[PDB]
TrEMBL record, chains A, B, C, D:
Membrane association type: Multi-pass membrane protein
Protein name: Ion transport protein
Protein keywords: Calcium, Coiled coil, Membrane, Metal-binding, Transmembrane, Transmembrane helix
Keyword Transferase annotated: no
Organism: Aliarcobacter butzleri (strain RM4018)
Membrane recorded as keyword: yes
Length: 219, 219, 219, 219
């Protein structure tokens, strides 16, 4: 059987049956949510998904016995492995967190389907040339969050009480979502200097988001 | 009579006689909005609009005995058929929405002019090449929209109660407009670990929607 | 005197006296606003500016009699001309609009100062390669504003009553400022389809802002 | 003793002994924020902080008898002098703000590491070349901020009453966050033609802040 499975694994129907399931799954699971769909076609997808999973886990064991060293070396494999594994924990045990990240198993329409594969390859191939910017940008974010946590937050709880909560707030000022009406003004209404806190922040941040784009255009 | 009409439908005057009309009709829609205009220059316009439809019909009819099957196979033409055909449905019947869509005969300034025609080819011939990750874009929604129906739907059913009503709130978060002060912040007061569901959704998209452009820069 | 003035006009002190005034003016006029500065040093800048203007207008007549044809041909000259001219209308006549656009006369720190001159030259040299995008973008904005004015606005006054007011609102949705909390949701609370109105709008708009940037990178 | 200290201040251990300290001290600031931590592990830390300052002083002192005048002329060094010098001002006296700025000794993770040092050169050597329009940027504010003090200041003195308080509201509008639903919309209800003052200010900036980047792409 060492030969047989391999000459089923590499076949065109084997590779277009897995692609056929993802789409159907994405379709049929995209109707698990409905507060009408499960009130009629209820038990249909409860045991349909149970066959989806059985087939995946069999498929994952099938490829192992074809090239095992080569499996746990492909960035698309160990993906499918664990991303199907997160599904294998039953309905209710420990936490719904596991149950939630289940339908993540559809992120194989990038794996199995060859067209997205190369572009996804071209998508991540950017950041190795973005770290310089990225590393210093957080080490600017780790200093500029603390000074928020112990100056402001003592009389501004939700917005700068904790260190996580400052990062929360400084990313929000970074997106510039509600950046000044929801943050600096009400802050300035108490400590009327927070414009020297946040204006130069905003100056140096953007400044360095401007020179990251240009870096991926030169290179 | 086939030879007789080619001398008209293709003539120099013909084009300019269209360009004269859409603009004049074009001014009488913005002028039509005025209720000081509808009670003194009402009957004037409503017979202008019965003139414009009639001339168009005549004009569309003139094109069919020339290109014939070269009409029902041109994208510039098949649209022009729609703007008359829906404008032909009478001053009542069904719903008033067809009677709204009679202001698409100003997008006949893009059909009737080649300099505007120039852009519509170049811009829309970009859509196909983007699907390489749009099919993925739609997928990540579809997957996470599911999870963002049971997770937050029941507690918050204005934003997440229905898969499609989750799709909305997800699109918005994606566009970043009021993800913090709008949706997350309150979605936390009941779900402390609600940032775990979002900031990656928020991230992954930021990475992907940017990465899409990095490939458009290249290709 | 045909010779003399010219051999003062082209001199280094003549050209660094005009640059010296702009900075001082920007400084001293940047203190006209203060509700303390004019309550003490009040009459100082009221008659200081009166000498600024006299000197400019003399300087503008001085260059005319050096190369007059060549003056009304330079994009930096006719600027200074009219942009000083807007200043010449007295304090109170007609409308404060004229008085307001006065301090615009400081936009000569780009004219007289040579470093900004070339970069400003390199700043406008872009748009001749941005019209294709720009022309169709407004002719998308002139159709997608009307249909807002006569569908929505009849029961949504401030946001889509008038045609100017729709452009007002569609640019706001274009910046995506408060785009969905301040507009589509409250709209959807009445006509629950406005997500088919505004979602595809947002799709096609951004789409074409993405392919304008890439156009100035290729070229 | 000059030859004796060069064997230390430049040694391999020396660097790692700094890198050991900033990180450990670095963990005890975020840990310091906890009031469950200040009432049980309080005295521990307050003597850690008296240890860290002392070792640093010693460490800064070690550098001065080597580089001597090559210290007070290095940008990496002159900053490190500031973070001790302001951290040296006692546990009281003047204002508590100097006692806040003792969390800049984590920006000593950027001085003490060359891989972080790599970025700070490249990013900040960009500032000078941008002045070509920043000197213009500041100018357009300065000019229009003036006008936006008499125009809207008196009616609305929370946002425009003071030149500097206009500078703020202008910066915000520039960053586009709540220019519509925030400032213009209400500034209209009294000043119908308030969009004439803003949408160009809004425009010109959009043109200039983008144009700045178009030159950074090139240079």
């Amino acid at each position: 059987m060492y030969l047989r499975i391999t000459n089923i694994v590499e076949s065109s129907f084997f590779t277009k049956f897995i692609i056929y399931l993802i789409v159907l799954n994405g379709i049929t699971m995209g109707l698990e949510t409905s507060k009408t769909f499960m009130q009629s076609f209820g038990v249909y997808t409860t045991l349909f998904n149970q066959i989806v999973i059985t087939i995946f886990t069999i498929e994952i064991i099938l490829r192992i016995y074809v090239h095992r060293i080569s499996f746990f070396k492909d960035p698309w494999s160990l993906f499918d492995f664990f991303v199907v594994a997160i599904s294998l924990v039953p309905t209710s045990s420990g936490f719904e967190i596991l149950r939630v990240l289940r339908v993540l198993r559809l992120f194989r329409l990038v794996t199995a389907v060859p067209q997205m594969r190369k572009i996804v390859s071209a998508l991540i191939s950017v950041i190795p040339g973005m770290l310089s910017v990225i590393a210093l940008m957080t080490l600017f974010f780790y200093i500029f969050a603390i000074m928020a946590t112990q100056l402001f937050g003592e009389r501004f709880p939700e917005w700068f009480g904790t260190l996580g909560e400052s990062f929360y707030t400084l990313f929000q000022v970074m997106t510039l979502e509600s950046w000044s009406m929801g943050i600096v003004r009400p802050l300035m209404e108490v400590y009327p200097y927070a414009w020297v806190f946040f204006i130069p922040f905003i100056f140096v941040v953007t400044f360095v988001m401007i020179n990251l784009v240009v870096a991926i255009i030169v290179d």
